[PDB]
Design a protein around this ligand. Structure first.
Ligand SMILES: Nc1nc2c(ncn2[C@H]2C[C@H](O)[C@@H](COP(=O)(O)OP(=O)(O)OP(=O)(O)O)O2)c(=O)[nH]1
Ligand SMILES: Nc1nc2c(ncn2[C@H]2C[C@H](O)[C@@H](COP(=O)(O)OP(=O)(O)OP(=O)(O)O)O2)c(=O)[nH]1
Ligand SMILES: [Mg+2]
Ligand SMILES: [Mg+2]
Ligand SMILES: [Mg+2]
Ligand SMILES: [Mg+2]
Ligand SMILES: [Mg+2]
Ligand SMILES: [Mg+2]
Lengths: 431, 431
């Protein structure tokens, strides 16, 4: 039921907010814009670590583009939905801008829990507990708590950052429940690991300490259970599909364009792989009148994004009933007519950009930096009577369980930028 | 008896030197001035490590100021003492300048055994043997020798530096016995640890290898025993109180002034905490005519130092008999009327200067530097057949017991400046 999916509740509320008596979905955008976690995204790795103030993307600019594309997708889908179910507007009072606001707010914050150095950073944080110092804690934690530690993802960290309670400020940013539902793409815990081939089962979305919180949200939105066991799991919110589609479109095209502009990909491929996407709307005279690679690739990027957005809207509207029922098992991008072109673009990006020498060098350095910082924090946690551990506490982190302390350490390491992490690493070693 | 406390003996002497047949107490000043250990004090930490050639103090300038204040205190106390005991001048032949010379010489060398990076350096050297590599030696040493290693202080190292025998030069600097007595403030060994609440029992003053030497000195000056056990301990030399008073006055006031000049303390506090000390002699017109913070704080510092010096002289002359008997249990500064102001100044200095971010960064770096250098020296000591250990010996240290070798390693690390230690650390790691 769509009347329960578009909820306006906030954490710690007793009177039900109504749409007629209102806007809630724009304050979420404003609150995310003005927060420190969002501001820390300006110097976090998207693909190339330590961007050197070049023209390449960071996490912040990527999130902004995903937000624009998400607003467009949400507006179109909301128009079609309001056409399909008239009573959503004539009784409850929902307009087609609310869907755009929800998807834009969710897409702006979709990537906020990521640590420095990107995917390699998450792998390093996991390997620290798996085959490093943190291994010593294995006997002192529940299997669900250990699987949280050794398979750390930014998806759970983002939910925690968004919904963190502190003395005097309950609920953290206190976003609406619809935004939280559209933000979550893996509504399950860390065990069991990969129970099936469903798209919503690749990873997990919340930690144990936050688990209870999500239950509340999942009760309010009327999500559909899938547990059939002692481990909880729910079905996806329908707008989470749109969030994922926007994320995928943006990074797939922009990575290719950035690699072309950097000199790692020849310009010819730009027309070898993209023409079928842009052939139906390209103006040949305008394309031929341009005189630099940047203009041509920008033109192609704009046309491709438009085409993919339209196709994604059509695909979503086709399989709406299955998504509402919970039986859909793929993403909207896998039901597309240009899957071969996307696959070729991704494979070329993997061969040329992800495995380039400079990228590998930066990832190797990031492994060492993260391991050193985590080991210092953990050793200061174990013994708190020495002078050195007091100094470490004063520099890095100015009544809890062991699991809560370890989660706090992981969270505090992941709020740093690449530059701050490198500077602290050099300071620890006195260089 | 004061005739035995003002002794002119030197190490390796058989004919008793007499005051009538003389000056001995000034050659000590000259010999300390011209020695390499005194010259190494120019680049050693007082409060802020790696001073960056700023206006802040180092160990050398601090020692010079302590020497000036000590000369003043000694001159005043010697005048009053010669007034009290006439026979000290009419028979033996002691003038009021001898006390000033003794206190000045002792105060100039009071701080010569300190390692690089200050207090954090001593803590690092101790922690290396406590919870580091050096722990392996615990089973091979006597409990008194291990407590020397794990509670390393600069007070014992200074005595060793002053009285070190080498082939062709016995006695080291060969200072007079009165100067050595006034230099020592903790005449006891490293065990037992803190037997009481006496001021002279907080730490220890000599190592085991030097123990016999001090006994000789303690026999010549007629110090009073306090052992009542198998572990030796004596009472303090009376002029050691004056040395300690001068040290305390100087660092307490100058730390505050330096923090004000650096921008870490607001100027208002300068008059909130100091007025009662300077209110009885301050000229208001001169204070108001000045136009910079530096001039005002310098004026206040001068007035405060004068007031505290006078009060300390009065306090010493009040409790003279108890100090001579050995029953005095506090310092001269705790019997003062401005204890609350001193306590407030010290607490503000701890909150603002000792715990500032830059200071913590430098201390954290110093821990790593000292640990690396000590581990290299110890590993070269254990195995001496490898090529690498021969290289280490040639770079760092171009028939003894294990304890003597470990003490020598600790001494050789503590003669380095901060810059030399950092340069050697970088060279070891090839950066
Ligand atoms: N350097 C580097 N970048 C990578 C690698 N794998 C993926 N990336 C980049 C490509 C994209 O810019 C970005 C994709 O991360 P996102 O968090 O936006 O989504 P992703 O689909 O990777 O995962 P998620 O939805 O969070 O489970 O990461 C890799 O192995 N190395
Ligand atoms: N950075 C830093 N400086 C400190 C700390 N504690 C004391 N200091 C500084 C303040 C003074 O400038 C200086 C005092 O050392 P001294 O060797 O002159 O005498 P202290 O009374 O500390 O000890 P002592 O008579 O040697 O047992 O050390 C600390 O925790 N951090
Ligand atoms: Mg992500
Ligand atoms: Mg994804
Ligand atoms: Mg993204
Ligand atoms: Mg000292
Ligand atoms: Mg002291
Ligand atoms: Mg001193």
């Amino acid at each position: 039921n769509w009347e329960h999916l578009l909820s306006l509740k906030r954490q710690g509320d007793t009177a039900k907010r109504l749409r007629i008596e209102q806007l809630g979905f724009e304050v979420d955008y404003d609150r995310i814009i003005f927060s420190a976690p969002f501001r820390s995204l300006q110097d976090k790795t998207q693909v190339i670590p330590l961007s050197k103030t070049d023209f390449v993307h960071t996490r912040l600019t990527h999130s902004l583009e995903v937000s624009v594309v998400g607003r467009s997708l949400g507006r179109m889908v909301g128009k079609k939905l309001l056409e399909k179910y008239p009573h959503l507007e004539q009784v409850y009072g929902y307009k087609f801008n609310d869907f755009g606001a929800i998807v834009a707010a969710a897409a702006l914050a979709h990537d906020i829990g990521n640590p420095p150095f990107g995917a390699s950073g998450e792998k390093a944080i996991g390997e620290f507990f798996k085959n490093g110092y943190g291994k010593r804690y294995k006997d002192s934690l529940t299997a669900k708590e250990y699987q949280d530690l050794i398979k750390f993802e930014g998806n759970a960290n983002g939910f925690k950052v968004l919904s963190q309670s502190k003395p005097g400020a309950q609920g953290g940013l206190r976003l609406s429940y619809a935004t939280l539902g559209a933000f979550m793409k893996y509504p399950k815990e860390s065990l069991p690991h990969k129970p099936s081939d469903h798209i919503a089962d690749k990873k997990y979305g919340f930690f144990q300490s936050e688990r209870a919180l999500f239950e509340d949200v999942a009760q309010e939105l009327g999500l559909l259970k899938r547990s059939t066991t002692d481990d909880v799991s729910w079905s996806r919110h329908p707008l989470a599909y749109l969030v994922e589609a926007a994320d995928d479109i943006c990074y797939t095209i922009i990575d290719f364009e950035d690699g072309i502009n950097l000199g790692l990909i020849p310009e010819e491929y730009a027309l070898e792989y993209m023409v079928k996407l842009v052939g139906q709307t390209i103006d040949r005279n305008k394309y031929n009148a341009l005189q630099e690679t940047s203009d041509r690739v920008s033109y192609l990027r704009a046309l491709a994004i438009g085409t993919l957005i339209n196709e994604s809207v059509d695909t979503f509207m086709k399989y709406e009933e299955e998504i509402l029922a919970g039986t859909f098992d793929q993403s909207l991008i896998d039901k597309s007519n240009y899957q071969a072109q996307i696959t070729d673009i991704i494979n070329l990006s993997i061969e040329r950009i992800y495995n380039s020498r400079e990228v590998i060098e930066k990832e190797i350095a990031g492994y060492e930096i993260l391991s050193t910082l985590l080991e210092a924090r953990c050793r200061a946690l174990d013994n708190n009577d020495t002078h050195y551990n007091q100094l470490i506490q004063q520099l890095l982190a100015p009544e809890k369980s062991l699991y809560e302390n370890l989660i706090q350490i992981c969270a505090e390491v992941s709020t740093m930028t690449d530059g701050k992490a490198l500077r602290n690493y050099k300071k620890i070693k006195g260089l």
